[PDB]
Amino acid sequence: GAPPIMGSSVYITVELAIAVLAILGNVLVCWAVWLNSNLQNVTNYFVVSLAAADILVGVLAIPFAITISTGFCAACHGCLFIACFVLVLAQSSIFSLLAIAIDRYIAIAIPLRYNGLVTGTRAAGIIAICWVLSFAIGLTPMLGWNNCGQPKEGKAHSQGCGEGQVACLFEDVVPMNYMVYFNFFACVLVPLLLMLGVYLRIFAAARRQLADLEDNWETLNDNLKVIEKADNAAQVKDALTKMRAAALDAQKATHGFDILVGQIDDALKLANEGKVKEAQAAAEQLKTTRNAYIQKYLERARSTLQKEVHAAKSAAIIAGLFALCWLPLHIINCFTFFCPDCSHAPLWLMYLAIVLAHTNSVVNPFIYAYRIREFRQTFRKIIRS
């Protein structure tokens, strides 16, 4: 058989290439948030909490993965920490991803009291609590749910491990039922589905508001084309009482309205006196008020919704890339567990799956750089100076 040092050289160098990209790219994220005050908000705090996980992936987790690739002798609980620490960072990433989506829902759903609800110092507390839980979840094997009780003594003596030591291998110390049932199903798969459900609600609530706003603009123009051809002298009272509610229904969304509703009740009084031809003249004052004031609100509020949807889509790419990079490893675990008769995945595909999961730590800085204008210009200034 070919020497394992040669095949490891490709894996180790590709691993070291990723760690350099992971650290550099995400230090740039934190650096941009520490400087540009316009990026300092609750959403980007979870982003920095996310980048910090990715930095630690390159600083500690990737070096660990290289060390296990050797199969070095070590005490079981020590090896158990090397093999599990990446689960802590990966769990921290999920909590950060779920926080980002929930924050975006709160902003798109109830924007009126978002500033009072989502606080800067409350996010710091949530981030802290999520990091503590991530150590608890990721280091659960160290609490007893491990295979240190039944070591492979034959593999340990084959490689000359000392007393109380074992050949360090992820599958040899971490039980596959923890990985599939506890880690993947409950602490990875369910939160991603919940995340997916939140994003469905955001895009639905966004699409509805964008419709809800235009139905007022259609009711305001259609009723403006009904008043000037009315058989009954008080028929326009129907189209004016409905426009008063439609103007207030759009005024509750987000000076020119007091001019609009003021002209509304002016033509409404002329409908209570049967003067149809004179209210029809007063009903055309609204056309001038609409073009100068109301249409601008429609366009500003349609632009703000679009900017939130775009920011909602940008965060959704991040969570989607997370699943794309980690699912292969999780599914590989699902086959080994649920099918002891199947052929176990070769070592080259494993390394491929492992490298794929580490690459997720490099793609987050390129997304903000390509999809967020404020992040992009801050990234350039840091490098230019």
Ligand SMILES: CC(C)CCC[C@@H](C)[C@H]1CC[C@H]2[C@@H]3CC=C4C[C@@H](O)CC[C@]4(C)[C@H]3CC[C@]12C
């Ligand atoms: C501030 C940062 C860098 C601290 C990093 C701590 C890391 C590098 C330390 C903390 C605990 C350590 C482990 C504790 C126990 C053992 C068992 C021993 O037989 C082999 C080394 C091994 C597996 C250690 C490897 C290094 C280790 C994982």
Ligand SMILES: CC(C)CCC[C@@H](C)[C@H]1CC[C@H]2[C@@H]3CC=C4C[C@@H](O)CC[C@]4(C)[C@H]3CC[C@]12C
């Ligand atoms: C949103 C999606 C990706 C959810 C994840 C789907 C996962 C959990 C599904 C999709 C394909 C499934 C695998 C398909 C094939 C086999 C081989 C069979 O002998 C045992 C079950 C096993 C190993 C399945 C385990 C569960 C599995 C990995």
Ligand SMILES: CC(C)CCC[C@@H](C)[C@H]1CC[C@H]2[C@@H]3CC=C4C[C@@H](O)CC[C@]4(C)[C@H]3CC[C@]12C
């Ligand atoms: C989820 C999206 C990104 C697709 C990712 C591709 C992954 C999930 C696919 C591509 C190749 C697949 C592997 C091909 C070969 C084997 C050997 C077999 O005995 C068990 C299943 C296993 C280990 C498959 C697991 C799933 C697999 C790793």
Ligand SMILES: COc1ccc(N2CCOCC2)c2sc(NC(=O)N3CCC(C)(O)CC3)nc12
């Ligand atoms: C998402 O789950 C994992 C996360 C992280 C790791 N790493 C730990 C640190 O070092 C790098 C790898 C691993 S390793 C792994 N499965 C594994 O080793 N198996 C033995 C061979 C097999 C074909 O039977 C399949 C099962 N799953 C994971």
Ligand SMILES: CCCCCCCC/C=C/CCCCCCCC(=O)OC[C@H](O)CO
């Ligand atoms: C805003 C920044 C906030 C930063 C907040 C960082 C706090 C992280 C602390 C986690 C400790 C919780 C660990 C819980 C589980 C530990 C189990 C364990 O480590 O057991 C090892 C044992 O000694 C082997 O024999």
Ligand SMILES: CCCCCCCC/C=C\CCCCCCCC(=O)OC[C@H](O)CO
């Ligand atoms: C900025 C700070 C960054 C800090 C970055 C730290 C990187 C640590 C990574 C791997 C160390 C793994 C340590 C374990 C590897 C050696 C264990 C060993 O050689 O064991 C011999 C055996 O016990 C004979 O019987």
Ligand SMILES: CCCCCCCC/C=C\CCCCCCCC(=O)O
């Ligand atoms: C900014 C800090 C960067 C830290 C980089 C650390 C580099 C670690 C890379 C490789 C270390 C691998 C250790 C050797 C594995 C065990 C070999 C053996 O004992 O047989």
Ligand SMILES: CCCCCCCC/C=C\CCCCCCCC(=O)O
């Ligand atoms: C290890 C499995 C998971 C363990 C879950 C139980 C521990 C976490 C449960 C609840 C913590 C909720 C955080 C409450 C912080 C109080 C904030 C405050 O002081 O206002």
Ligand code: NA
């Ligand atoms: Na990550």
